[PDB]
Every structure is written in structure tokens, then in C-alpha cells.
Amino acid sequence: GTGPDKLKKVLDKLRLKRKDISEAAETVNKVVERLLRRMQKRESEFKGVEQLNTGSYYEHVKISAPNQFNVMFKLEVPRIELQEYYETGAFYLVKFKGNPLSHFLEGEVLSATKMLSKFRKIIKEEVKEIKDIDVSVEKEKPGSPAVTLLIRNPEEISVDIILALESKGSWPISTKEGLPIQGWLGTKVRTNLRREPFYLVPKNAKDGNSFQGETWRLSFSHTEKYILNNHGIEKTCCESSGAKCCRKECLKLMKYLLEQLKKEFQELDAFCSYHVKTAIFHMWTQDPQDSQWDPRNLSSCFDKLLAFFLECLRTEKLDHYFIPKFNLFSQELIDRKSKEFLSKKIEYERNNGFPIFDK
Ligand SMILES: Nc1ncnc2c1ncn2[C@@H]1O[C@H](COP(=O)(O)OP(=O)(O)OP(=O)(O)O)[C@@H](O)[C@H]1O
Ligand SMILES: [Zn+2]
């Protein structure tokens, strides 16, 4: 009946949804592994592709939609020269310092359009050879770089395949002051994480253009998975020989709150789960102690995350955790109107016992 007990009940409800999600993921993994084997056997620019096992499913925070999965295929690309397209670090053009990708160049710039067109062509050919699972490729949607598989098991599962370039060079200068984990996971962890590769994912800017179509966004999905699964100041946080915290529980509740609100109000189309993830990264930095995230504090921790998110909405400021000058809540990206509408809705739920969770 009480507020704290109701929030625990929501987490139970989310726990129950994970069984269908896990079962669907087994089918997705079967298909993805079959497709990757075919891609690794075929001679092409994409022969070196591998699954990057990142994203909400592998972070254990996929809370809904067992019929929709996102999968990343990484391709190592040596000697990438990056050019900032936005000096905030929001977008990059890829250039090079013979080139295996030389067929995808528009002058000196790597064409995401050309490279994705061949990627899609090959995936479509190889998926047709998968004879023992019912799987097809969804017709291409303009503005959507994903190559989407449709699996029927017998129910339909959609799998968005995202091509990600992997660079082993040092991280871009736009990330210099990002990943501010020094007081939480520490300086040794930060140094080790920044020695890992980084990824580039195709994404159109839509603006004055010229090179619209050929821009890429940075991706740190591997780092984010590491942080989600190694999220405590104590190394034993949430391990068998350690103490549970409520960090991931707060993430799941806030993701669910946003997902429920977005279902009801098309005014919220501009918001996405990555805004919640980015906000909770900042909150984990602000409140680094595991004791601040004791399971008994679930309700007060969720409330302080809501308060922090409301402050980001009010100030129209939510910095990308890895790229500090990239403001995800800029007036340019999300109307002041949309932020005020979401602030009103979150405040309502907060002061009335979260009726949208009852749905
Ligand atoms: N607007 C965005 N800006 C930057 N990265 C984004 C954005 N939207 C999604 N991502 C990327 O999505 C990755 C997470 O993949 P995932 O499969 O969890 O997709 P999702 O749509 O964010 O998740 P969910 O289905 O749980 O809501 C993150 O590593 C992040 O880099
Ligand atoms: Zn923990």
C-alpha cells in the first residue's frame, strides 16, 4: 500500500517481464551468430565483423519490448583520421592517414551511405541462406541506418543491426574532460577505460548539409556496459560476497517511467532512454558512495534522480557523459515546449504516487 512498497511492486513487475525478454534474446542470438558466421566466411570489406555485446540487454536493464532488439556489429578500421564536424564532438567525418575501404570513399571522406549500402546488400544475400530459422530483412526505411532483421519464432522479433567502426587510436579530444569517474570508480579505472577502442556509428546531422549522409557519432557502448556492470565504489558491489545497491533498480524505474509516459503522449517523441542513462551517470558521479544507494533508500534515490532530471529539463542542459560540450538537451535538439511538458508530467506522477506505473 505504501509509496515504498508500491515502488518495490513495480520492480517485481519489471522482473517478470525479463523471462520473455531472455527467451526472445536466445532466438536473436541464434540468428545473429548464424549471420555473423556467414559474414566471416564471405570475402568482403566486412569479413572482419564481430558482435559487440553491448546495449541494454547485456547491461541487464532492458525492461520492455521482447519483440525488439538492437545489435551492434563492429568492424576494425585501421588508421582513421577524425575530423570534428560539430566542434562539440556531436558528429565526425572519417578520413584516413592501400585502403580496404577505398570503395566507400567520397574523395577523402568515408561515405556512410556507400558503406551501409554494401553492408545491407551482403546481409540480405546471406540471410536468404539461413534455412532453418524463419528470418528476413525488413525493407529499407529512408533515414534509418539500421539493417533490420525480422525473425518469426512464430511471433515476430525485430532486430536492428547497427554497423560500428572500431578505432584503436586515442579517444577524440572532445572527450578529454568526459568520463568524470575519478571520485567514484577512480583514476586507475578511468585510465584503463580510455585505453580501450572507441566506436563510430553512422548518424545524419540534418542541417546545412553538404556532408549530410556522411557523418558519424561517437559510441562508447562498451565503456557504458562496463560501468553498468561495475558500478560501485566497492569492487564487491552487487556481487555474491558483497552488498546489493539500488543503482540499476533506479535506472530501470526511470526508464520505465519514461517509456510509459512516451506511450501516452506523442509530445515526448524527442526523449529517449539514453537521456535517462546519461542523467543517471551524472547522478552516480554526484553521489558516488555505495551507502548512498542502499536498497532501503530505493524511494529516496529514485526521487533524487527525478529531481536531478527535472533540473536538467529546467536548465535545458544534459551533457553527454563522454563528450562534455555535447548538450543532449540543447534548445537546438529539443524544444523548450517539450521539456516543460515532460517536467509537468514527471511532477504530476511524483506528487500523486506514480499512477502511470499502474498501467
Ligand atoms: N541519442 C543517443 N545519443 C547517443 N547514443 C545513443 C542515443 N540513443 C541511443 N544511443 C546508444 O544506445 C546504446 C544502448 O543500446 P540499447 O540496445 O540499450 O538501446 P536503447 O534504445 O538506448 O535501449 P532501450 O531499448 O533499453 O530503451 C548506448 O550505448 C548509446 O550509445
Ligand atoms: Zn551495486
Side-chain angles (χ1 to χ4, degrees), residues 231 237-238 243-245 247:
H231 55 247
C237 191
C238 293
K244 274 294 280 153
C245 77
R247 284 191 182 94

Side-chain angles (χ1 to χ4, degrees), residues 54-57 59 61-65 68-72 203 217-222 224-225 255 259 272-275 277-278 320 326 328:
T54 61
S56 63
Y57 178 67
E59 299 173 327
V61 299
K62 177 175 172 57
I63 55 158
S64 62
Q68 192 293 141
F69 289 77
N70 292 323
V71 166
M72 278 186 67
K203 179 188 164 60
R217 72 159 177 77
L218 298 174
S219 172
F220 300 93
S221 76
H222 58 321
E224 295 174 15
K225 174 187 173 183
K255 283 179 68 166
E259 160 191 317
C272 69
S273 68
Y274 195 68
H275 295 141
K277 196 183 199 186
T278 297
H320 194 294
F326 179 20
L328 311 183

Side-chain angles (χ1 to χ4, degrees), residues 231-232 236-239 243-249 290 293:
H231 55 247
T236 55
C237 191
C238 293
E239 291 183 351
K244 274 294 280 153
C245 77
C246 66
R247 284 191 182 94
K248 297 180 91 171
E249 294 70 11
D290 296 347
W293 300 87

Side-chain angles (χ1 to χ4, degrees), residues 53-293:
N53 298 315
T54 61
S56 63
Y57 178 67
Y58 287 113
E59 299 173 327
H60 314 295
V61 299
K62 177 175 172 57
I63 55 158
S64 62
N67 66 341
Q68 192 293 141
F69 289 77
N70 292 323
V71 166
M72 278 186 67
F73 282 7
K74 76 182 198 217
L75 183 65
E76 192 171 326
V77 178
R79 312 169 272 261
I80 285 175
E81 271 209 314
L82 286 185
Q83 179 213 299
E84 298 187 342
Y85 183 75
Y86 288 15
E87 288 188 278
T88 65
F91 292 104
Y92 288 81
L93 302 179
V94 169
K95 312 186 180 164
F96 297 98
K97 270 153 201 332
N99 189 340
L101 306 186
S102 63
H103 274 74
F104 306 143
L105 289 178
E106 276 287 301
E108 284 170 2
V109 178
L110 178 65
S111 168
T113 299
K114 291 195 186 301
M115 184 173 186
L116 285 170
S117 162
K118 191 83 188 308
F119 189 61
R120 178 186 298 281
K121 181 184 182 57
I122 295 172
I123 288 175
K124 282 173 68 61
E125 287 187 9
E126 296 299 329
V127 162
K128 295 205 155 63
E129 298 290 311
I130 302 198
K131 294 319 177 34
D132 59 349
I133 308 206
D134 191 350
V135 56
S136 56
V137 174
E138 187 175 72
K139 303 56 47 183
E140 182 174 2
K141 268 127 199 73
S144 315
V147 179
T148 300
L149 304 185
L150 306 170
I151 305 166
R152 291 153 281 271
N153 190 54
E155 85 281 329
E156 190 185 74
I157 306 161
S158 298
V159 181
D160 282 2
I161 302 173
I162 309 296
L163 173 72
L165 312 182
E166 180 181 68
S167 184
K168 291 177 184 298
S170 51
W171 289 13
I173 197 52
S174 67
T175 72
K176 196 183 154 244
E177 295 319 328
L179 194 55
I181 68 181
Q182 292 89 341
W184 166 38
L185 311 183
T187 59
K188 285 187 302 296
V189 165
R190 191 176 183 272
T191 292
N192 289 331
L193 290 179
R194 291 181 73 83
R195 294 181 172 152
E196 310 253 44
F198 66 97
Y199 300 85
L200 291 147
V201 167
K203 179 188 164 60
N204 272 359
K206 161 156 69 285
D207 60 3
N209 292 7
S210 313
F211 287 111
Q212 211 262 359
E214 304 334 331
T215 51
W216 306 74
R217 72 159 177 77
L218 298 174
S219 172
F220 300 93
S221 76
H222 58 321
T223 318
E224 295 174 15
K225 174 187 173 183
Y226 172 92
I227 293 167
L228 264 290
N229 291 342
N230 298 267
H231 55 247
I233 200 169
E234 289 193 23
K235 289 155 184 184
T236 55
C237 191
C238 293
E239 291 183 351
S240 50
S241 273
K244 274 294 280 153
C245 77
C246 66
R247 284 191 182 94
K248 297 180 91 171
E249 294 70 11
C250 286
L251 179 50
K252 287 186 290 197
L253 292 170
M254 187 78 170
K255 283 179 68 166
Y256 190 58
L257 180 58
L258 184 65
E259 160 191 317
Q260 292 293 260
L261 288 170
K262 283 171 60 60
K263 277 180 50 161
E264 266 175 33
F265 304 111
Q266 144 282 311
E267 294 85 352
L268 301 180
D269 282 0
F271 297 102
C272 69
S273 68
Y274 195 68
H275 295 141
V276 173
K277 196 183 199 186
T278 297
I280 213 172
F281 282 159
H282 288 296
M283 269 309 291
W284 291 341
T285 303
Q286 186 195 279
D287 293 353
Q289 293 299 323
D290 296 347
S291 58
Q292 292 176 282
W293 300 87

